[PDB]
Design an enzyme around this catalytic site. Structure first.
Site, short mmCIF file in Angstrom:
data_model
loop_
_atom_site.label_atom_id
_atom_site.label_comp_id
_atom_site.label_asym_id
_atom_site.label_seq_id
_atom_site.Cartn_x
_atom_site.Cartn_y
_atom_site.Cartn_z
N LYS A 1 0.83 -1.19 0.00
CA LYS A 1 0.00 0.00 0.00
C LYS A 1 0.88 1.26 0.00
O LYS A 1 1.92 1.27 0.64
CB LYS A 1 -0.86 0.01 1.22
CG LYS A 1 -1.80 -1.15 1.31
CD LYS A 1 -2.53 -1.05 2.65
CE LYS A 1 -3.48 -2.18 2.86
NZ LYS A 1 -4.67 -2.02 1.99
N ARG B 1 -10.01 -11.79 2.49
CA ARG B 1 -10.90 -12.87 1.98
C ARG B 1 -10.24 -14.25 1.98
O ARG B 1 -10.92 -15.25 2.12
CB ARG B 1 -11.43 -12.56 0.61
CG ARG B 1 -10.34 -12.49 -0.43
CD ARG B 1 -10.84 -11.78 -1.65
NE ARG B 1 -10.93 -10.36 -1.41
CZ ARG B 1 -11.25 -9.46 -2.33
NH1 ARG B 1 -11.51 -9.82 -3.58
NH2 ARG B 1 -11.31 -8.18 -2.00
MN MN Z 1 -5.32 -5.87 2.23
#
Ligand code: MN
Ligand code: MN
Ligand code: MN
Ligand code: MN
Lengths: 512, 512, 510, 510
Positions: free
Chosen positions: D290, D364
């Site tokens: 990120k 997920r």
């Molecule tokens: Mn993530």
């Protein structure tokens, strides 16, 4: 000409799809199949019914095709010994297996796959006005009609000099054959299919053919043909009369902005009163908030909402529905130049509310704001329901996806009613959050009543664009408001779908 | 004025470079060196030949300079006791050592380094019309001529009020001295040098001086001076006559687009027939696909291809080459505004083929498409060879680099012939992939015959821009097609090079 | 997980067999040996009289031939065709191959053969289903490759196939030429085997195919083939001065390795070739970390090593008369505390110092050590060095998806290599060879050179080639062919097995 | 450092107490028990006659009521009000709560209760300062939550508070309802305790709350509460086939863990519920790293685990008649040499293979193993599975800052859950449930599925839900409620404690 040929094409437009049933087909064509290209579409179970074995194209190769085809795919054969009008030795037969599975949010007939199977089958078809029979085992007539209409290759096109042949490749005449006489009737389905296709052509027409003047021209012609009143507020009349949203957005363009409103009062009625309002941005450059190239391509489609409401209206008049209707098209081109409305300019919409522009590419809600105020305060009647349709936000796709339009609705019952029309029509919707108390804060301005673009992009942005439009509702409006963001459903595989009119038609049809 | 002074400057333009040889120099100047500033350029071996010791500037300091200079660099001394016309005590002498190494794809005389050594030497020169002698040991006359011409400081410039002195700093008069009488002859080299310099000035002139009208004006004047026919299709005549590529790209600009075609039929011939076509985008904003600032700077040079073909033509007429020639300049400014052609608009080029615009900044291939169709279908003769030149793609630099123009050619022999002209002229080229079957798929359109911009940027994009242009060749054209992408070779150290005309001249010179 | 993938690679056999119409008619006297048939040919080839004599010909097939479109298939059920199974219907797919081909392309257009065949084989579900592919082209080698790469032997871990060698064995192909092919069927089978093995190596993920498991595969093949093999692993690379490959790979969990195989043919020969391949089993970028959409597919950054390895494998198996070395430059370009830095100065085996200005330009560093090893550290003197690598995104920009960019120091050898590209269908195209302009892009103020270009818009495919050339032994007077195959290594997001056949064809003609 | 944070969580008690006007008047016969009072009500509620009878009512307070603006506070010093302290002045803040609420919102508007109360409490400096909050709403549960989350028990390390349990104990609140509340005060205190504990867990930084210290907290609670607890840690996850959670977390310093608590109530019940929570204690992105401005706040990527854990904690403490499992999916998504790669193929516990195309879509993956565990590896068969997670940035785009997006496979249960959202004030809204359109976004050519969508503009909140649903046991015929609470987990850059009360209310009504 160029443009006037496209206009003439739209004004006279008929569909190339006809509807019938197996029994009527057997009575009319006793001298063999009326075509040499046949598509048979059904679920795994529907394709194994006994009635299939009696159909005029059935033969051992077709039976083998039924055994081998895969879910979601076609399987093609040449069928020998099937008598046909053309006396071909072989008839081309394509078997398409439609999934039976459907979610509660989807049309259970899965017209999404009907359309893609049919589209793929029709790619084999070369020649002019080639007759194709599509035998379908679903009885979901309206949904099949739409799917067939949008797959019948009557799209806009300028390939191979077709500018001289009404911007249309006339390669297919479809006959859709239901198991039994359909509900709605074939004549009703043909009106629906016609509107779906006309909408499709309007959307994918480029702006050098379909601009604010030529769109208005089409609507004026239909109004005269249909016996409907039509009102046009164009250019400086918009400025002079206080429609500062739509005027400012469109003033920079070569062709002037216009608010075009059609009216229909049925012969004997009236069961409800409905105002339709549509975003008719014939091209969206972004204005001074100029879009990058890869976001500017496809913005000829930014008039999809106007095409939807216009073609829905068209269907309602043609089917003589018992509902008083207005249809307001909010027509502008969002251009860039010296005259472009600026990031910081303050506009006074027709509602009297001031708007500080903080993104010129959030222009659709400005034209709609003037449109919904016009519909709720400036026209001859008081609608019970206002439906506005638009290709509004990229966020729409993020939230509700490519095949479900996002709906922002101020009444729970009417939202459910609209979702139901989505499922019956195959032109499916899904709700976005309705919470005005959270949306209104995203448009705080230190110098005007509101800004036009959200402060935060991650705070229910599809809903906030809906709320902005709602802010310019007449303060006396106590009715139901259905806002439709159909940015992505308006197209598929880089082609217009004609989405909107059938959804709309089905919704109006079931009002009481 | 401002512009009309630049026009007058172009129309009367002469070079400041003269050519001669050592023997003729010794016969003409027996009263000492004719200059006080001397540059001597050669390889390590050439600088040690005995003949050097007999040259009029040779002295012990120059001999030391030869011993100390580094490969690729200059070494300067003051030479005492060298008799000279100015009676200076000291003559300034610069020794430049040229590498001997050259690849098979390069000019073996390495004019790239000749140019940079000479340029660096000429930075010492302050005053007006200062005489400089450049003694070169290479016999590659044409390549040296070009290098010298482009380094002689006759560039466009508006510094220090030079707008009133023809936008030229007249600080240097060069004499280039070959070891023996050159081939080509000095008068031929002077024509070449003149075209190189004129091209250089055209390219680096800003658009506020060199626009579509003033470029056309220059070409019209040359045509009258040279006895050549000239045809101009301007503005609305382009639209009315179906030249929708060049018209649409240019219609937004303050000065109208124009297709300017010059013709030359030699006195006694004809050995071949050649059509030249050049991209004359006098400024490229990007249009609605607006370039960012750091990609918009230098786009005054987007007319480099037009300058190349124009100056090549000029040389061919002046040297009375035995070849029938057309030269078509595709002149437009790619502007942004309300009238700008849109991302989604559909254009009908002169070829009759429809184009869906998916990037307005891929505009050069549109103007060329109309140009090459015009050259292959609308003019008085049938060319055997079509050469189009353009500053087309950033990808060109990625593929073939700063000093080799990328060439897309439909015939192997003619490609080799062209590469050979590149190596002799020093204006070097290199092939990009020729594979029409792979390129054509990058421009698939769902609504027109083709798009203008590739779907994938990583799939031989220099070649695809070539293929796009080829798509608008007349279907009866059975000839050779040479497409030249010279985006980067058109400039060096942020100054125009005059690239193109000499390459072209050498290619035409060797046709049979 | 990994040892099952290794066993799968080591024992690998193709599912494609080759024959001709006459041999087919003599062997299959009970009619067609399959009930699924593909017939591929040009418009003209599909209308020859000889077609009418083929065992699947019938009126439906004749109609299919009339209706099919150029570049597409047209499927029928053929009734009344004799077949071994005595099925009523035989499935027949007619694929029309374009006849048009540019001078830079294979004239048999195996690109379309492959896509037609691949599309046809999507209809095949069950296990070991027999398919006959009748082709009207005589371009045996190019057809073999196309068929091999379309035969659905790809790597796959769907549906528990990890336990069945990461392979969906759904098809057995038999390719039927008009006449006995050249090369022979046994030759084409070796070629097809190498194409498929290369395909599987490339698309295997790094959690299965890392530097140790790739080396393991090569060691096994070397033993099986009677070839000598040399492995310089880990700290031995550092200690011995191989600072390019060592530094690139030292951060990874699995150590870098230089793996070199050798083959001396049974019969004497004069021709000597060194192959060198970029075996970056995964490319994160290192500290020059790739964004996600550029990091996906970087399991394929070992494509060049797979190519040279599988070409070598073919050459040994066909007993080609050429002495061969094959050097695999194996590393994972990882990120972490130990990652080589942007600014670090490395000393490659060549003795030249390199200032790292982009850690994601790592392939040329491992190749630099590789080509020096091949040209200076090795028992023989190659006449030709061929290095193969998935090097630059620029490659695609320059020469496209289907033509590997080649940087070659000799005109004749370049033409020779292009010719092998056209015959194999594994096509190439030249990028600019101009060392005098490339070398300036790697100026350093503190080392002999940088590894990454100063300007990205100055023949960047060529400059990466030049970098590798900078570490050639100063002795080396031979031909150097540098192959940038970044994009041709894959198609529709699946490995193509590109490289080995191009290579095989080049060596075959040397 | 860490063990002090652990001790703080384990022994945690709320600072909020609940009562009613009548009980308050009977107990505090010497006047107001505090000298700082907040009175919160709608415009109408603030003008009822009953207000005039309240112990802080006086002319200044009456004037405040007249002047205050909707959505704002108005402060006075009230003179002549009897109070226990006998102060001359009592500080009184009047907050006007809007009466207007949409059908999708809690009609008591606890959103504004919370912001008014929070603003009022900024004036409070000293230690354990008593504040009375008189509320005119009877929406007990929603008020309790709002008060709890505004009572300044947040995590904090300012001014050496690391030594005082990372807590500024500046306020004791007493919330005074008009009449004895439903739920009861002892119930509301348990709820408030869980809200506050959840708040502290979320805003704790990862250097204090990692996978081991979170597991430690849960283990302690399990022992204290008499609940069974199962921990699958580290290599046990790999060895047992939990390749989702193992691979995501294997790079981190502190090993991944699947922690499952169980509760069987004293009294028999029929209702059985599995809770599963995303416990990503920090999300770097992994190799899909990120950027800084998206990496800040990722200490909160364990919000879903905190939610389910604190909901469970409430359910056990209130002795709710429901059998419950609570599975915490604990991992840190780290970057390094050992990081799972973009291209790696994982085998989740479900046996389905996953090609990783974005390592930052990691939640997920850990949930996929979690929901399979809950639906297949566990001693009972849940009727309902609820998974909670801070999953997507898209969630905010779709449903906004204050409404968690819910993906639910059953209409009725979705309505039931929305209703719990409105009663708790921890509001939700549906995202599209259409598996047939979601599954196509994760097509892989080499594995059963990818983990990241091909297109980002196609109901991406829903597709992340669908991914998790793909790893449900094929046996599972029950109701599945997936909660994406990325944005509701925080407000003004501080944790909200969202989740546990929503959950508690849903279970309470089951
Ligand atoms: Mn993530
Ligand atoms: Mn816009
Ligand atoms: Mn451009
Ligand atoms: Mn790299």
């Amino acid at each position: 000409s160029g443009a006037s040929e496209f206009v003439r094409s739209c004004v006279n437009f008929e569909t190339n799809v006809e509807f019938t049933d197996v029994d009527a087909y057997k009575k009319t064509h006793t001298a063999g199949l009326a075509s040499t290209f046949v598509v048979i579409l059904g679920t795994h179970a529907q394709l194994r019914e006994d009635a299939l074995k009696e159909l005029p194209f059935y033969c051992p190769a077709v039976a083998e095709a039924i055994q081998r085809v895969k879910k979601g795919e076609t399987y093609a054969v040449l069928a020998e010994g099937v008598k046909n009008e053309a006396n071909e030795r072989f008839v081309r037969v394509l078997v398409g297996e439609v999934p039976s599975e459907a979610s509660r949010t989807n049309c259970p007939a899965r017209p999404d796959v009907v359309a893609s199977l049919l589209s793929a089958a029709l790619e084999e078809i070369k020649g002019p006005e080639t007759k194709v029979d599509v035998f379908v085992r679903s009885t979901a007539a309206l949904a099949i009609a739409v799917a067939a209409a949008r797959s019948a290759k009557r799209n806009f096109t300028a390939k191979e000099g077709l500018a001289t042949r009404g911007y249309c490749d006339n390669c297919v005449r479809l006959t859709v054959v239901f198991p039994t006489a359909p509900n709605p009737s074939p004549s009703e389905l043909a009106v629906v299919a016609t509107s779906t296709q006309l909408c499709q052509r309007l959307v994918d027409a480029p702006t050098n053919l379909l601009n604010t003047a030529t769109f208005a021209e089409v609507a004026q012609s239909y109004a005269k043909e249909l016996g409907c009143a039509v009102d046009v507020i164009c250019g400086e009349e918009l400025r002079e009369r206080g429609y500062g949203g739509i005027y400012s957005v469109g003033k920079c363009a070569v062709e002037a902005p216009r608010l075009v409103t059609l009216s229909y009062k049925p012969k004997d009625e009236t069961r409800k009163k409905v105002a339709l309002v549509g975003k008719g941005i014939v091209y969206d450059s972004g204005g001074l908030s100029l879009k990058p190239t890869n976001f500017m391509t496809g913005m000829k489609r930014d008039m999809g909402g106007a095409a939807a409401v216009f073609c829905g209206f068209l269907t309602a008049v043609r089917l003589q529905m018992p509902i008083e209707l207005s249809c307001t098209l909010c027509l502008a081109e969002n251009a860039i130049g010296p005259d472009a409305y600026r990031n910081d300019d303050i506009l006074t919409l027709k509602s009297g509310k001031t708007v500080e522009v903080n993104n010129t590419d959030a222009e659709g809600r400005l034209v709609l704001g003037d449109g919904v105020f016009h519909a709720t305060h400036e026209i001859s009647f008081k609608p019970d329901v206002l439906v506005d349709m638009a290709t509004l936000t990229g966020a729409q796709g993020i939230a509700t996806g490519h095949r479900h339009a996002g709906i922002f609705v101020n009444d729970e019952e009417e939202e459910l009613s609209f979702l139901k029309a989505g499922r019956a029509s195959g032109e499916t919707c899904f709700p976005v959050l309705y919470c005005p108390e959270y949306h209104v804060t995203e448009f705080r301005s230190p110098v005007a009543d509101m800004r036009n673009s959200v402060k935060q992009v991650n705070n229910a942005s599809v809903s906030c664009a809906g709320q902005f439009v709602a802010n310019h509702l007449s303060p006396d409006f106590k009715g139901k408001h259905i806002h439709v963001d159909m940015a992505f459903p308006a197209f598929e595989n880089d082609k217009a779908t004609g989405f909107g009119p059938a959804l709309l038609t089905e919704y109006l049809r079931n009002l009481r």
